[PDB]
Ligand binder design. Structure first.
Ligand SMILES: CC(=O)N[C@H]1[C@@H](O[C@H]2[C@@H](O)[C@@H](CO)O[C@H](O)[C@@H]2O[C@@H]2O[C@@H](C)[C@@H](O)[C@@H](O)[C@@H]2O)O[C@H](CO)[C@H](O)[C@@H]1O
Ligand SMILES: CC(=O)N[C@H]1[C@@H](O[C@H]2[C@@H](O)[C@@H](CO)O[C@H](O)[C@@H]2O[C@@H]2O[C@@H](C)[C@@H](O)[C@@H](O)[C@@H]2O)O[C@H](CO)[C@H](O)[C@@H]1O
Lengths: 307, 306
């Protein structure tokens, strides 16, 4: 059976799986006080995609469809299509369209549109509030706030390109976004379905290891921290390789190729997340050429050396 | 290590010249002009070329600090590297990795964070890559924005690209010009360290292009964007680094439903694809179709017409 492996890529060469931006660093912290249940960047080590996860790094937090103007406002409702412009099927056994944002916040970007007949084009500043009663991507509709009440046309292909996040600066700083609070994918007063499960370390002394980026901020004082469980490149790689898991835990070493030495070891769990032996919040200090390498499959009793 | 290409459909892959998905395959003649893109350039044995780097989300992004051009809404960005380290103009590359490789007007958003208090801001911005002051190789690019006061000096600033524009008062689709390289060091300078121009050499053959449609943000732009390799192929070859056993890898495009070959093509070692066809042609492919490496061939192999 095919041997398992992970990509030979540095952290900085890789991409966040929850927003279309580069990874910056590795971070570990306790998470017993809240639920860690992201829906993007979810994949098993043998390559089964979970939650709302799909393969394209650039389609994460993008929307495509057609728009209808909400009379008396500068707001539009997008009737969602699939990422390839085919019809979106709300009965599919997924929480929401693939690539839908998996946190509550205000995401700013640009809504662009092309008129099919003459190739005329237009673009407008736009924000989607993923905590809104009318954020209902699972049902196929999302509301955007824009800076126009007239420029967008009906029945024309329209795209939302995400840029960053905002916060209302009149209130406590860094109180939004809330990266670990899932949206209600079917709108107000609904229950989410088909979720990738919440994750937690079980082993004494262990914490999750997070792949961390800083989202661009577009206004106010947002919390720009964004942690994913797997780099997007690992999702892509496991999907291609489809190597069977020989146990529930793959032991990885983080190696400095400059010296040939292991900096730390960690557990890549079969269901698609990483733990390390550490207590407390810590930005890992790593050499720039460092990368992860698969060592072996281990049993349920394997104890990691302190990170 | 045996050579191979990824099992990904065209629609599952990403353009290597702008951060958007692939849509389709196109072939056409290109003997009348120079095809020399600098992004999406990689050899089959994993050597990166031109301005090519590995992540699709960094293509056509800029990072640095900005200085206000007084009496205007324009800002000069002093470029940093993707990780905010110093940009080194002496590196033997044409321009910073991911620099746009076509002349046009790219619209996006300029964002900024103030280090001390975490205050943030974002403004509509356009970079004209044909401008005299587009000099990314020297570490400077100019943005036109919708503010004359909101950006601060000495604070981390990023440009996120969204799409392209055109001046609608003039002939439609006359810009951008995807096959015209910028002068990376500005006006009256010559580019250095370029990935080479590509052309078919075999009679009856044409380049095969991996095509997307860039978003348009204003006017009547030419939104066609053709790359020589999907970004995922750059990533895959860089990862695999399989030695090339000849200068030409024969690929078959297969329909997995029927097992039947739709067409075959040549993947050249230096990193581009050719097919046997004459004229402009949008390929009609099944959505689940994919490329399969079958064998290395010599310089004399004749493709089946497609
Ligand atoms: C739409 C618009 O005209 N935006 C201006 C505006 O933006 C302000 C405004 O939205 C207030 C409302 O409470 O919130 C902020 O003050 C916001 O400014 C933005 O966030 C602050 C914290 C700073 O980081 C600032 O740089 C950023 O623009 O006013 C600002 C300047 O005050 C700009 O002029 C926007 O274009
Ligand atoms: C800059 C701005 O505020 N944009 C407006 C404006 O945009 C126009 C304008 O820039 C002219 C200048 O010659 O060029 C276009 O007409 C542009 O409109 C954009 O492109 C045209 C072809 C249409 O597709 C249009 O929908 C698109 O906005 O005026 C327009 C109204 O026509 C909008 O109000 C923009 O926000």
């Amino acid at each position: 059976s095919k041997p398992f492996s992970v990509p030979v890529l540095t952290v900085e060469e890789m991409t966040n799986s929850r927003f279309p931006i580069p990874l910056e660093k590795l971070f570990t912290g306790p998470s017993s006080a809240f639920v860690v249940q992201p829906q993007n960047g979810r994949c098993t080590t043998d390559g089964v995609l979970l939650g709302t996860t799909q393969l394209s790094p650039v389609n994460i937090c993008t929307f495509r469809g057609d728009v209808t103007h909400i009379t008396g406002s500068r707001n539009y409702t997008m009737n969602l299509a699939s990422q390839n412009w085919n019809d979106y099927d709300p009965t599919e056994e997924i929480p929401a369209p693939l690539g839908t944002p998996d946190f509550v916040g205000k995401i700013q970007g640009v809504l662009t549109q092309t008129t099919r007949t003459d190739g005329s084009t237009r673009g407008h500043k736009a924000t989607v509030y993923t905590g809104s009663a009318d954020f209902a991507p699972k049902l196929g509709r999302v509301q955007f706030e824009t800076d126009t009440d007239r420029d967008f046309e009906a029945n024309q292909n329209t795209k939302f390109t995400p840029v960053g996040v905002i916060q209302d600066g009149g209130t406590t700083h860094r109180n939004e976004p809330q990266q670990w609070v899932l949206p209600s994918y079917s709108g107000r007063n609904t229950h989410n379905v088909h979720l990738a499960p919440a994750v937690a370390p079980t082993f004494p002394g262990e914490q999750l290891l997070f792949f961390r980026s800083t989202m661009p901020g577009c206004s106010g004082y947002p919390n720009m921290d964004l942690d994913c469980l797997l780099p997007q490149e690992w999702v892509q790689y496991f999907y291609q390789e489809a190597a069977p898991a020989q146990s529930d835990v793959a032991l990885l070493r983080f190696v400095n190729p400059d010296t040939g030495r292991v900096l730390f070891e960690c557990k890549l769990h079969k269901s698609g997340y990483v733990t390390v032996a550490h207590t407390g919040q810590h930005d890992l200090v790593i050499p720039p050429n460092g990368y992860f390498r698969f060592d072996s499959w281990v049993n349920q009793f394997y104890t990691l050396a302190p990170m």
